[PDB]
């Protein structure tokens, strides 16, 4: 009963944000680690939905699914360390940031159910704002446990769900194509109508 249009229902599903490749050989990540800055716009449809308002406040829930490029399941161990905002990030496999006790880690196996954690509201202000006339959530670092390189190629996929959603000050929805990230810039030489057109005003 009008409970599908609430904001909690509007933002209620886990969507794929981000993907990490750890190839056996190549140039994508020569080592066995990667850094992924947390963002909600990894999901393609998220930006236009969130930018309907000016201020937002929510928690997050992350799930990690790992497998071989073909989809196989292999006996491997991973780390999944979380770097809070304002803290240094790893630079190599031998970096000392991988064992700093203030960065929580989740040791898990591939032959296991996907890992799941929760992240609270991490802003100094009272809400995130997508427009500032004048939003760091953290970082996830993924590696393979060991002093030697792994024997398999791996892919990690991250899914995020938002909980306890609140919003303020609605705005008009986006009309033109985006050009940059965190920028309302638009192609000024090609402006398109909001919808379709017809031949005359007197004809259906």
């Amino acid at each position: 009963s009008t409970a599908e249009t609430t904001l909690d229902s509007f933002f209620s599903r886990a969507g794929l944000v981000g993907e990490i490749d750890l190839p056996l050989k190549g140039t994508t990540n020569p080592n066995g680690y990667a850094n992924w800055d947390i963002d909600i716009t990894g999901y393609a449809q998220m930006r236009r939905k969130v930018e309907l308002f000016t201020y937002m406040r929510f928690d997050a829930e992350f799930t990690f699914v790992a497998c071989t490029p073909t989809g196989e399941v292999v006996p491997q161990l991973l780390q999944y360390m979380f770097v809070p905002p304002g803290a240094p990030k790893p630079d190599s496999r031998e970096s000392l940031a991988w064992q700093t006790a203030t960065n929580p880690s989740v040791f898990v196996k591939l032959s296991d159910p996907p890992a799941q954690v929760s992240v609270p509201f991490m802003s100094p202000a009272s809400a995130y704002q997508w427009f500032y006339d004048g939003n760091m959530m953290g970082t996830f670092s993924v590696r393979t446990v060991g002093t030697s390189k792994s024997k398999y190629p791996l892919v990690v996929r991250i899914y995020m769900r938002m909980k306890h959603v609140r919003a303020w000050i609605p705005r008009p929805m986006r009309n033109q194509n985006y050009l940059f990230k965190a920028n309302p810039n638009y192609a000024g030489n090609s402006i398109k109508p909001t919808g379709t057109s017809r031949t005359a005003i007197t004809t259906l």
Partner: protein, 223 residues
């Protein structure tokens, strides 16, 4: 020693599942929330807000894009002549794509309720005339002339008496109803006043409108 059974839905990840996970940072205290004005908790509040309806979605040039927000009423058009016509379909392609109701109902699959359309006359203070606004239920054709449209749901709008008129459209769901505007009299104006004016149409939803079965459905590219 407690026995268990491990039912057949055990090690599965359903993306629409709701549960409780392990917090990664206990002992952390988030910033307390101050009061910010303008909080919205349901989307129907946004659906119930009047927005401009582009009845005149004919032009497509970059510099003629602002002409889509109004349609003219001139002094060289005779009586009994059709002015404009549009459907009553918020969720389909057409004039309703410019309103917030159409954009918001493009995120769902089903809808039903009542609507209302408001017309505003922006001519001079010395212009007079009359218009006929008619509504045709679903399944009927467009009236052939003003007299046929008179025998039905209609209203007579007088420029001198009123500057705005409203038209409540009864139930719609999911063929659609039609709205047409006819000339009743001619455009009367004294000497020294412009011969043409424009009408602005505003559309919204009533308090019995609902939406269901959310979709995502969008074609604006991130980068």
């Amino acid at each position: 020693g407690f026995p268990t059974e491990l039912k057949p839905g055990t090690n599965q990840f359903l993306t629409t599942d709701d549960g409780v996970s392990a917090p990664i940072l206990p002992n952390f205290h988030p910033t307390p929330c101050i009061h910010i004005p303008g909080e919205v908790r349901n989307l129907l509040e946004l659906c119930q807000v009047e927005t401009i309806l582009e009845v005149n979605n004919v032009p497509t040039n970059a510099t003629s894009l602002m002409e889509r927000l109004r349609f003219p009423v001139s002094a060289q058009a005779g009586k009994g002549e059709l002015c404009a016509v549009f459907r009553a379909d918020p969720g389909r392609n057409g004039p309703w794509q410019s309103t917030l109701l159409g954009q918001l109902c493009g995120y769902y699959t089903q809808w039903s309720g009542s609507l209302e359309v408001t017309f505003m006359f922006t001519g001079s203070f010395m212009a007079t005339g009359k218009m006929l606004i008619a509504y045709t239920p679903p399944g009927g054709p467009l009236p052939k002339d003003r007299a046929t449209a008179m025998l039905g749901t209609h209203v007579i709008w007088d420029f001198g008496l009123q500057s705005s008129v409203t038209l409540v459209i009864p139930w719609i769901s999911n063929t659609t109803g039609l709205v047409s505007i006819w000339y009743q009299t001619n455009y009367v104006v004294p000497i020294g006043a412009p011969n043409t004016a424009y009408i602005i149409a505003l559309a919204a939803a009533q308090k019995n409108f609902t939406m269901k079965l959310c979709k995502d459905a969008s074609d604006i590219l991130q980068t």
